[PDB]
Amino acid sequence: MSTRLKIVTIHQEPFVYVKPTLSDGTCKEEFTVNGDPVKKVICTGPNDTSPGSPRHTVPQCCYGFCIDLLIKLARTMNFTYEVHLVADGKFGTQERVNKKEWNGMMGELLSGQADMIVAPLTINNERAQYIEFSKPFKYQGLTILVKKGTRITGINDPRLRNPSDKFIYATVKQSSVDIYFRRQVELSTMYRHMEKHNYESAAEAIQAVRDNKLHAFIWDSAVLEFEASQKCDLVTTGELFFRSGFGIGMRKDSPWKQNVSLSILKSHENGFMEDLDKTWVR
Amino acid sequence: DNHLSIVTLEEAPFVIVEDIDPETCVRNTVPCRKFVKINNSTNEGMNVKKCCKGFCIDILKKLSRTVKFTYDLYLVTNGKHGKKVNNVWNGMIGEVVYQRAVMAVGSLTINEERSEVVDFSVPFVETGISVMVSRGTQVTGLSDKKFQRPHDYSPPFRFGTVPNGSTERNIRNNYPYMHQYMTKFNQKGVEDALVSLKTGKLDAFIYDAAVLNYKAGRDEGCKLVTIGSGYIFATTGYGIALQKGSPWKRQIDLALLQFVGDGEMEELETLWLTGIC
Numbered sequence: 001m002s003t004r005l006k007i008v009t010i011h012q013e014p015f016v017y018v019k020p021t022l023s024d025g026t027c028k029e030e031f032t033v034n035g036d037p038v039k040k041v042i043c044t045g046p047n048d049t050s051p052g053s054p055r056h057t058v059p060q061c062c063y064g065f066c067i068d069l070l071i072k073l074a075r076t077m078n079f080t081y082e083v084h085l086v087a088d089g090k091f092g093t094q095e096r097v098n099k100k101e102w103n104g105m106m107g108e109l110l111s112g113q114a115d116m117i118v119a120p121l122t123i124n125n126e127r128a129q130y131i132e133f134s135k136p137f138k139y140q141g142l143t144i145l146v147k148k149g150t151r152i153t154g155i156n157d158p159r160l161r162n163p164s165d166k167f168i169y170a171t172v173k174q175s176s177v178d179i180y181f182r183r184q185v186e187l188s189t190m191y192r193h194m195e196k197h198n199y200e201s202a203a204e205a206i207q208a209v210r211d212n213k214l215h216a217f218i219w220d221s222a223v224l225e226f227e228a229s230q231k232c233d234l235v236t237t238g239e240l241f242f243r244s245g246f247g248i249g250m251r252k253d254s255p256w257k258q259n260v261s262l263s264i265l266k267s268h269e270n271g272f273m274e275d276l277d278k279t280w281v282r
Numbered sequence: 283d284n285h286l287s288i289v290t291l292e293e294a295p296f297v298i299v300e301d302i303d304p305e306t307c308v309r310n311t312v313p314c315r316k317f318v319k320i321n322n323s324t325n326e327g328m329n330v331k332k333c334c335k336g337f338c339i340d341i342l343k344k345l346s347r348t349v350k351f352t353y354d355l356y357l358v359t360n361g362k363h364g365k366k367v368n369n370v371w372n373g374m375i376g377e378v379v380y381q382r383a384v385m386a387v388g389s390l391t392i393n394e395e396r397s398e399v400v401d402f403s404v405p406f407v408e409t410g411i412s413v414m415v416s417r418g419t420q421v422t423g424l425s426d427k428k429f430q431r432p433h434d435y436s437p438p439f440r441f442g443t444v445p446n447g448s449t450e451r452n453i454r455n456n457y458p459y460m461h462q463y464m465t466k467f468n469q470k471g472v473e474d475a476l477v478s479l480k481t482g483k484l485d486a487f488i489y490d491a492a493v494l495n496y497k498a499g500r501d502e503g504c505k506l507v508t509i510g511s512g513y514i515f516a517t518t519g520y521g522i523a524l525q526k527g528s529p530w531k532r533q534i535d536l537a538l539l540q541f542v543g544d545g546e547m548e549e550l551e552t553l554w555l556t557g558i559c
């Protein structure tokens with residue numbers, strides 16, 4: 001009987017934190033430094049994160065910048081919803097099967113497994129051909145994460161432009177960064193190295209930089225800078241390249257698209273988005 | 283139905299208007315007409331052939347080529363960017379609302395109330411509200427108590443904006459005391475405001491982030507600066523305004539996203555917006 005919107009998200013701190021529920025099935029009552037209670041949602045998702053493995057779905061606790069944004073959107077527009085984490089753990093690329101298919105949250109939204117994507121989902125040309133993106137809720141770019149001590153000028157450093165098996169670098173598989181390094185002819189050499197080392201998740205990659213398994217991680221500045229400020233053993237290097245925004249994703253025939261963008265614009269104008277930025281990102 | 287009526291407005295470096303060759307539009311310029319009145323006792327006037335260039339004009343050239351349309355570019359004469367008066371829109375927004383233009387190209391800020399009456403493209407220039415001061419002036423930003431509670435200071439801080447645009451609308455909505463206080467310091471335009479900042483008649487000038495960053499970058503002697511590292515309150519962007527339900531939006535959005543991906547936007551930023559300071 002449920003007419004609730006199905007929301008798909010992904011584990012991606014500081015936008016989406018994913019934690020286990022307590023034994024009673026509720027979310028641990030936590031507070032910000034501002035003394036305000038952290039709003040939390042029950043989000044179902046697979047427990048076994050491993051690829052090509054059976055997915056056992058369990059209720060979990062979701063919170064962060066994107067959850068606070070969802071709550072405001074649902075409040076403003078008066079919609080009911082239920083949250084789940086993308087079964088395959090990916091953002092979403094279109095891959096060759098003659099036929100082509102979308103994976104990640106893109107695939108879930110297009111199949112009908114989701115009615116809206118509320119995550120740090122990059123707005124790019126490839127996705128915009130198939131889905132409606134709201135006006136951006138955040139404008140950021142790409143940067144590089146390294147272990148402290150490593151010296152790199154940025155993307156144009158000889159250790160990246162002239163690859164070798166000595167210095168290993170990567171990004172997340174089936175993500176907008178993966179799309180970008182594959183589309184741009186000028187990044188072909190860089191992509192050929194990366195396609196061999198690319199990680200299943202940003203968290204797996206950040207941990208491998210810490211464990212000296214990966215030397216450089218190319219990812220979203222909004223995520224990398226947050227990680228660098230929290231883990232002082234990791235530092236962001238170089239200047240920002242490929243600037244892009246994050247947007248809410250919907251199917252092209254969604255009746256909510258105009259009011260989702262209007263709500264995002266209202267939130268930028270009244271300081272709500274800056275409040276979220278202060279609570280979670282800076 | 284490929285030949286489109288397009289409205290623009292002069293605002294350097296986004297749209298720069300020049301006189302025609304004393305016979306046509308040479309170089310990187312495109313023709314733009316401006317309706318000029320014979321006098322103020324009549325509605326009679328004439329179209330004056332001018333030449334247009336700039337960051338937004340280069341975007342229009344790329345879109346025209348990629349999306350495959352031709353156009354008749356004109357400069358708005360009824361207001362500027364867009365203001366709602368008793369539910370009646372003027373400026374570039376008004377021209378689109380009242381279907382005298384298919385699209386508005388320029389330094390046009392995306393905001394919620396304009397989005398209720400027009401469709402905006404994806405943003406293609408990052409902007410919002412910034413504060414220009416003479417180097418050394420101590421203000422944290424738009425939320426500093428000098429702005430929020432001006433009369434707590436002796437003498438009070440003197441600050442203003444150019445009224446009737448998205449900056450004034452935002453301040454009116456968010457900071458009612460600040461807005462009613464600022465109105466005595468309303469500036470006719472950006473050139474008058476900068477001169478008031480230099481002649482010591484103004485302490486701060488609040489305006490569109492993209493235009494202030496450009497003006498700070500070219501300021502003679504680099505005396506005038508934007509607070510913070512060019513901090514932006516009410517972050518937004520410039521977008522192309524199209525009529526609600528426009529068949530042109532899909533392709534324009536796809537073309538603008540394609541331009542960013544290919545580094546073609548970064549080139550325009552290098553060519554038109556960067557400066558000495």
Ligand SMILES: CCNC(=O)c1c(C)sc2nc(Cc3cccc(C(F)(F)F)c3F)cc(=O)n12
Binds near residue numbers: 264409
């Ligand atoms: C064609 C894709 N556009 C871009 O990659 C892009 C620029 C190239 S400049 C710019 N500026 C913002 C700033 C911004 C931040 C938050 C919210 C908004 C808004 F809601 F107005 F759209 C913004 F425009 C967002 C943004 O995507 N771009």
Ligand SMILES: N[C@@H](CCC(=O)O)C(=O)O
Binds near residue numbers: 364447448489491
């Ligand atoms: N870009 C603004 C004009 C300048 C401003 O008010 O800051 C607008 O579209 O209204």
Ligand SMILES: [Ca+2]
Binds near residue numbers: 133404
């Ligand atoms: Ca779109």
